[PDB]
Structures are given as C-alpha cells and as structure tokens.
Design a protein around this ligand. Structure first.
Ligand SMILES: *[C@@H]1O[C@H](CO)[C@@H](O)[C@H](O)[C@H]1NC(C)=O
Ligand SMILES: *[C@@H]1O[C@H](CO)[C@@H](O)[C@H](O)[C@H]1NC(C)=O
Ligand SMILES: *[C@@H]1O[C@H](CO)[C@@H](O)[C@H](O)[C@H]1NC(C)=O
Ligand SMILES: *[C@@H]1O[C@H](CO)[C@@H](O)[C@H](O)[C@H]1NC(C)=O
Lengths: 534, 533
C-alpha cells in the first residue's frame, strides 16, 4: 500500500514490478488532480488549484482524457507515425473522454532526492494523452521521477477570440499549473524540485519550446529537452485564432453581437459538440493552438528567443533523419520511387501552401527544385523520394530547431543538439523509410527493455535495447546534472553545441560527434530563401 | 643529313639527341612554310598554298613569329601562368617578328606513325608554337608532333562584319596548315589517316572551333581539348565591327566604306597595327574568331547540337585551379580573402559577365550562397579557394562539360579529365592548385629533360612518373582513339557519357570518378539562366 502525503491530501498509489528482472519495481500514482476541473464557468478560464480531500485518495486507475476525437479529421502530417499507424490501439486509451481531465501520472523508482522529468505529450494540439506512455522503464533505469500529464486540447484548450473574452493558451496554462504542482509537491515523492526537466516530442516539444519563452513558467523548471519540434514551425502558433473561432461559432450556431456573449454561449454547448466540428485550417497550419496573447506568449516566439528569456534553461534538442515521411507517402509508387512530374508537383504545391503565391514565386520554386535535386544521380526515382522527404524535414524541423539551438547557445549557455538516425523495424512504416516523426520516443522511454507493446509492435533486436539504454542514459544524465555525460558513463562524449563549432550528436547504433548538421541546407532556408522573394 | 621530299620541294632538317638516355633521338624540321606569305594584297585574305623551291631547303632554325607585342597590354587572366611568370624568356622567342610567319615545325621519331598537331594560344594576340619542343612527346610516344605558327591579333582576326574583311584568318591558317600535313606528312613517315589536333587554353578554344567547321572536314580525325572551349566568354568575339572601327580611328584609317578602310589598313605597317592599345570588355576579346557564316556558320553551341563534331574522337578536360588570376589581386599575406573582398569580387564578376540586367541583385546573392562553405563560413583561406572555383567553374568547367555532354550525346567516343597535379616553383603561389597551363609540361614530357628556361620547375621523380603516364594516355588516344590502347600503364580511363559522367582524375594517383563538380556545373547550366531575363 504505497502512500504519499501532499499539500491537498494523502493519496494511495500502486507498486508495480517491471517484467525485466534487472530493473527494479516502481511506485506509480495515476490520476492526481493538479487543478480544479475546468467545467461550467471554469471553461475557457485559466486553471485553478484543486480542492483538498480529507481522507486517503485513490490513485490506482487512469482518469478520463480531455475531450477529443481521433476519428474527426486532424492534420495527418503533424501526428507521429506510431500514432496514426495504430489508431485502433490508441482508441482504447481515448474512450470515454471527460472535460474533467486535468490530471497527471507519477512514476517513482524504489540515493538522495531524485530528479524529475515532466513529459508533455502532443499530436496536433487537438488530441493525445500522457496515459499512452508508461514512464516506468525510464524511471527505474535512470533513477529519476517521470511524470506524464493531461492538458486541455483543441477548442477547449486553445479557443481564442483575439481579445479579453477568450485570451486562449489554456492548454499551456494547464502545463504551467501542472509544473507548479510538481515544484511545490514532488518533494513529497522524494523528488527534487530544484532539478526539474520538462521534455516533449513533436507538438509536445513545440509546447516545451513555448514554455521556455514565457514569463509564467519562470522559476518552475531548470532544463528542457525539445524533441522534433519548435516554437518556429508553421504549425506551432496560430496567427489567425479570430478567423477559426468565428467559424466554430457559426457551426454551433453561437453567433452573437458581443464576443463576451458568444464565449458564454459556447459554455452552454456540450463539450462533445465543440470537439467534433470539422474545422480545417490552411495546409501545414493549425486552426486551434497557442496564440500570441501578449501575456503567456508576449510576442512572436522568435523575438522572444532573441530577448534571451529561455537562456536560463539547460536545453537539449534534436531531430530525426526522415521526419517528413508523410509529405511524400502519397506519391511513392510500388518501386519506391517518385517521378519527375510528381517531384515538380509536390515542390510547387509546397511553395503554394507555405509561401502563398507572392512576387517572384516562380523564381523561388525553381531554386527549391535545384537545391533538392541530386545532380550526381538526376534520374534516380528512389533518391528523388529521399530529397523530397528531406525538403520537408529540413524546412519544418531541422532549420527551425537549428535556429533555436543557435539562439539559445548564443552566449554560451548550455545547449546540446542531436540527429536521430535509427528506428525500429516494423509494419507501421514503409521499409525504405528512415527515422520518422516520433520514432525516437520508444528508445527514450525504454520500450525495447520490455519488448513489443500494443502501441509499439516493433520487432526489437539486441541492438535496439543497447541503444535505448544509451539514449536513456544520456537523457536522465541531462536531467540530473545538465550534462548528458555526467554522472553515469556509457558502458563517445556528447559535446556542447555552439553557433561557431556547431557540434551535434549523431544518435544511431553507430554513435559519434559531428558538426554543422545539414548546414548548407539550413543556410538555404535561413538566409537565401528570405532574399529570393520581396 | 636528314632529308625529306615534299610536294613543294626537298628540305633538310637536323637530327637531335635527347638528354634522356632512355629516349631515342628525333629528326626535327623547323620553319616549313605551309602557306604563301600573307602580306601586301595577301593580308586580310585566306591563306594560299606556298610556292615551290628549287633547291634543298635548310630547316634547322626557327623562322620569325607572327606580328605581336608582349609588352603591349592584353588580358592577363587569359594567359597561362608559365607564360606571364617568365615574360623575359618568352621575349627571346618573340624577338624579330615578321608578317611572313606561316611556318610549322615537325618532330619525327627515329609502320606509319600517328600525327599530333599542336595549336598554341595565349589570347589570340600573341604566342608561337616555337616555344614548345615536341621532341620528348615524339620520342617517348613514338608519334609525329607538329607545332605551328598562325596569324594572331589584328592580322589574324580583324573583321568588318561584312565582305571587306570576313575574319577568322588565324583559324583559316590552322586549316591550311592541317591540309599541308594531310597531303605531305606521309613523306615524313606519318599516317594522314591518324591525325590528332590538340591545344591548351585559347589554343583549345581554336581546336573546339575547328571541329565545328565545314572547312576542317576530312583533315583530322581526333581532337584533344585542354583547358578551353568554344563556349567561354572570350572564345568568340560578338562585336567585331565595334573594335575594328576603334582600330581604324587610332591608325587614322577610318572611312564610311568598309572596302576602303580595309584597303587603307593594308597600307599600314604590320608594326603599327599591333602596338595599338585596344582593350575589350572584361573577360571578353577585341580581336578573335567571329561568326562569319562561313568558317563559323553559327553560334558555337548551336553547331554542337547540329552534330558537326560527332565524327571526331574527342578528349577534353580542365585543371583544379584554372582561375588563379581571378583572385590573385585580393589575396592578403595570410593567404586569405576578406568577406568584404569576397562580396566585392563576386559583385564585380556579375557586373562584367551579365551586365546589370533585371534581377541581378537576386542572382548576385545566389552566386554568393552557392560558393560559400557554410561548414566553415569564417575561414579566409577557404574563401579564397571558393573564389578561385567560382571563376574556374564558370569559365572552364561548365563550358567544357557542356561540350563533353553534347559530343557524347549519341555515344561517339569522348573522354573527360580533371588535372589535379602541378610542379613546384616560384612561378605560382605555394597555396595554389594546378593553374592555367600547368598541364602543358607533363603533356610534353618536360620532367624527362629536367628544368628548362620556360619551365623552371623542380621536377621530382613523381613528376617524371606522371608525365610518362599522361603522355602514354595522350599518344595512345592519337594511335587508336582510345587512351588505354595499345600501350598499357606499367588504371583504365573510362568513356564519358551524359548519364554516367565518368572522368579521369589526373594526379599522382590516377582514378576514375563521376559527375565532376556536377552540382556546381548544374548551377551555371540550369538554375542561373532562370533568375535573370
Ligand atoms: C479506494 O479503493 C479501495 C479498493 O481498491 C477501496 O477499498 C477504498 O474504499 C477506496 N477509497 C475511496 C476513498 O473511495
Ligand atoms: C518480426 O520478426 C520476425 C522474426 O522473429 C520477422 O519474421 C518479421 O519480418 C519481423 N517484422 C518486421 C516488420 O521486420
Ligand atoms: C643550315 O642552317 C643552320 C642553322 O642552324 C646553319 O648553322 C648551317 O650552317 C646551315 N647549313 C648549310 C649547309 O647551309
Ligand atoms: C626546388 O626543389 C626543392 C626540392 O628538391 C623544392 O623544395 C623547392 O621548392 C624547389 N624550388 C623551386 C624554386 O622550384
């Protein structure tokens, strides 16, 4: 009977033994309320502290997830491969969602106060839950506390009228609120409030990125790990909340004169209704997500990076070899190639969606075509496919991540960069593909140590286990000391990243330090492309 | 007393033994007239057959070279490094030039032998085949080597853009010299059926043009085009009318009627026409080959598409650092180039070649980007290398590749190379790679004789070994049209085609590679035309 005392009352967790003998068991406390339920008047309002309970509270079972619908259309590209490939298994987690969903899960190892790693999940700002990820392995192996949380998503989480009626960013405020709770209470679990690291993958990483740039998050956590995401990608921030919110208002018939009144009208509607609505944004953009409210996000995220807000965090970030898999998947023939006409089509469509037919568009389009053509093997259809993925991977992930890594390490503050060049073999993904979006997740959470799971049907080798131990060792070490190499040595040194040297860690079965990761491509998007048009 | 009978008379050459003991002696016949003197009425007229001579002609000494002046300004970048670095020694060859200068030199080893006809070239204004001694190439490769003299500068390429002066007289001289060889080299033990013509620099620009001419038909079978093309900005003069009239004004021979001004120009001393300081636009030529519609029927690129030169076996290539003189002015004592200096030269380059058209600003930044090493942005030494490469790629590599592509289009025999070696000397900065003309000494086997007045290089044993290799490749091509047959190296030089793009990397360790600087070549060929109108 594992019990822990907190500022709001006592709660009872469970001791669960890992299938692996070598790994020790963990005490896990599921469904701990970190805020008062955001329902009724509380909807579209910042989170409030949870009420206290007089007795011992049961933390044995998973709570309801936040209102969401996987069947309803959402941007496919934004979601991790493991997610879309296994929608059936995911559905078992999402069933019976409730607006009362602000809960978190805690995984504690069985010397001294332990570091705390707070994970932020994320599919597309519309879906997902921390429940899918079981932090037991990461906790027991690295001897740290692992936390997975649930936050308001979609309409309920990010609705904004662009004024005082609905400022937005409620999903982010929940994360802040969840972080305060950990800061004030994790000491009760044997956790160190002074050593708190927050990390996420994909959209989760975009959230982590934004948390580092916020005044509200100041003092709560010390380090961040930003995996395959940034505050700078086209779908990280919604620059038209007013447009998409009114579209919602019309669909539910909540159209009225005063924005204050229409928000109130939205409060009356069932939580289910607001979610189901088919509100599609412009391609590679988001209809409901973080906005620049002037409070939580005081300015354009890039400007905030220049101002130096997030320099007081130790930061580790990186990308995968083939993130943008879904960008070309539609157009790949059975021979695993892409035709020249198809290449020209995708490149042009890419320029259409991202740059929107500006002056000199014809000039840029040809320039993009040139940079991502392998002139040493012009005709090869397979290589044509690789470059096409690379085009999307570089633009949406690599360049924004690198710009972030540069701006953070500008004054020597601790920064680490990586490129993930390995992935499990599975039927979830075409055999010709490299490490795709989210493919780093299983190794971070030590899935090969437990073997194949319902969510990761991968056929893990001994090599997979070996790398997973390595990745976790790097990851937990960073949490403990802000240095990937200390204190637990590998049984290669991960060098610090600075704008001049540009050293990064190539993570694969063959690990090594390298420099200037795709710098020529990164330079193209950062420097040359802004010049070509206007 | 080495004597040979010809269609124009008997002539006696001299037999000279090579300093290398391994190499056998050669019979050399110097100053053989291949055309009637182009003087008086003959000036600015196509070459005519040489008159016969009744006695035995002495061919032991060099004849006068064509009218030229090395002191008078000519574009420095166009000239080979060995030439400009040793103007003093060059001057001894150029002394006493005479308008009666259409002579050639023959080098014969002691069955019928292949004939290699070399065409020299600095800038169309100067030079002579006399400077190059084909004895080594002849004795080692067992082939006949021929170096010729042709009309240069005003006398060689003056054009009024009409019938008064069609131009291309320098090329016509080369054609005429080739006819002479075709009809008479059999008397020397040569095979008229196996004739290869080759040249370096502007000389290579000529060979390229000869292959595209109707006039050259039937004369020669193979060509070796070294560090030159018919497509470079300075290969063809597209404003002959403009520069010719400038000359007329300076000599005071300017008139409305073209026939009369040409006639007046005939009156002037050969001396007067040469000395004149007439500078063309940068990287362009004031006097050179023109598109007359006869010798050069159309734009050289168009002629390539039409397929004129497909019936020739062709071998061509470039050097690693051709464009040395493009950046030499701007190199600091640290052997580096500053960013401001980098931006300056790149901007000036776009100014000269593209002439400030619309979207020049967009193009300028794109050039800057492509030739910046973003993996070592700050390095001043690397900035220097890229600056050399920019000029090297644009002026030599890309035009050469385009030529090689168009020739091998239907599978006709083509071979490509990149020369990645050079001798150590004071002629050239120590940091430099193989520069313009640096392949010449190895082609002509200079290391076999050791350092000469024209090539003060300190040749190592490695230099000798490579020179043997290069000559073996070269002479093999002359004999069979294949670099590998019949004499084996004791590496196989693969044929070049547009898809595979295989080339021979020539250095102390020769090897086959593919798609030589293809990304850079593709930039100049495909992307750059798009940016500006
Ligand atoms: C918690 O669950 C246990 C059974 O697992 C039950 O005995 C206990 O009464 C529950 N506590 C509360 C407060 O409901
Ligand atoms: C899973 O492993 C088995 C061997 O145990 C193999 O037959 C199968 O191909 C593997 N699956 C994938 C997707 O590689
Ligand atoms: C032939 O010419 C050479 C020039 O090198 C001269 O020295 C020689 O005396 C001449 N011989 C005769 C027989 O005229
Ligand atoms: C002369 O040769 C030596 C090596 O034998 C070399 O180090 C030196 O640079 C050479 N000097 C010149 C002027 O070629």
């Amino acid at each position: 009977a594992p019990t822990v005392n907190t500022h709001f009352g006592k709660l009872r967790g469970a001791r669960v033994p890992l299938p692996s003998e070598i790994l020790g068991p963990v005490d896990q406390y599921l469904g701990v309320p970190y805020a008062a339920p955001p329902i009724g008047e509380k909807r579209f309002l910042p989170p409030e502290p949870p009420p206290s309970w007089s007795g011992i509270r049961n933390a044995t079972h998973f709570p309801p997830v936040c209102p969401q619908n996987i069947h309803t259309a959402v941007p496919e590209v934004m979601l991790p491969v493991w997610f879309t490939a296994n929608l059936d298994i995911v559905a078992t987690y999402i069933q019976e969602p409730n607006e009362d969903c602000l809960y978190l899960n805690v995984y504690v190892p069985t010397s001294g106060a332990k570091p705390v790693m707070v994970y932020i999940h994320g599919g597309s700002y519309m879906e997902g839950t921390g429940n899918m990820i079981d932090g037991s392995v990461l906790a027991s192996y690295g001897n740290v506390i692992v936390i997975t949380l649930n936050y308001r998503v979609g309409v309920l989480g990010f609705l904004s009228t662009g004024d005082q009626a609905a400022k937005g960013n409620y999903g982010l405020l929940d994360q802040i609120q969840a972080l305060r709770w950990v800061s004030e209470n994790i000491a009760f679990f044997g956790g160190d409030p002074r050593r708190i690291t927050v990390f996420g993958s994909g959209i989760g990483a975009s959230c982590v990125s934004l948390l580092t740039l916020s005044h509200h998050s100041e003092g709560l956590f010390q380090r961040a790990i930003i995996q395959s995401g940034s505050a700078l990608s086209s779908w990280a921030v919604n620059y038209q909340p007013v447009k998409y919110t009114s579209l919602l208002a019309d669909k539910v018939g909540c159209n009225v004169l005063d924005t204050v009144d229409m928000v109130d009208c939205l409060r009356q509607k069932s939580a289910k209704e607001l979610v189901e609505q088919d509100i599609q944004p412009a391609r590679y953009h988001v209809a409901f997500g973080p906005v620049i409210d002037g409070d939580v996000i005081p300015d354009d995220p890039e400007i905030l990076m220049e101002q130096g807000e997030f320099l007081n965090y130790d930061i580790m970030l990186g990308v995968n070899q083939g993130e943008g898999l879904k960008f070309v998947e539609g157009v790949v023939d059975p021979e695993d190639g892409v035709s020249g006409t198809d290449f020209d089509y995708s490149v042009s469509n890419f320029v259409d969606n991202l740059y929107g037919y500006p002056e000199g568009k014809d000039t840029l389009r040809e320039t993009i075509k040139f940079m991502y053509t392998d002139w040493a093997d012009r005709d090869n259809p397979e290589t044509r496919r690789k470059t096409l993925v690379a085009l999307f991977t570089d633009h949406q992930w690599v360049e924004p991540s690198v710009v972030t890594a540069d701006l953070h390490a500008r004054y020597g503050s601790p920064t680490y960069f990586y490129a993930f060049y390995h992935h499990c073999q599975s039927l979830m993904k075409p055999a010709w593909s490299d490490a795709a979006h989210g493919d780093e997740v299983p190794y971070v959470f030590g899935v090969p140590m437990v073997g194949p799971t319902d969510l990761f049907p991968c056929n893990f080798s001994k090599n997979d286990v070996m790398l997973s131990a390595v990745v976790m060792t790097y990851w937990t070490n960073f949490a403990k000391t802000g240095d990937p190499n200390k204190p637990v040595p590998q049984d290669v040194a991960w060098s610090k990243y600075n704008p001049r040297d540009q050293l990064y860690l190539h993570i694969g079965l063959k690990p090594r330090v390298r420099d200037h990761y795709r710098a020529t491509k990164v330079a193209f998007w950062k420097h040359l492309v802004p010049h070509l048009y206007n």
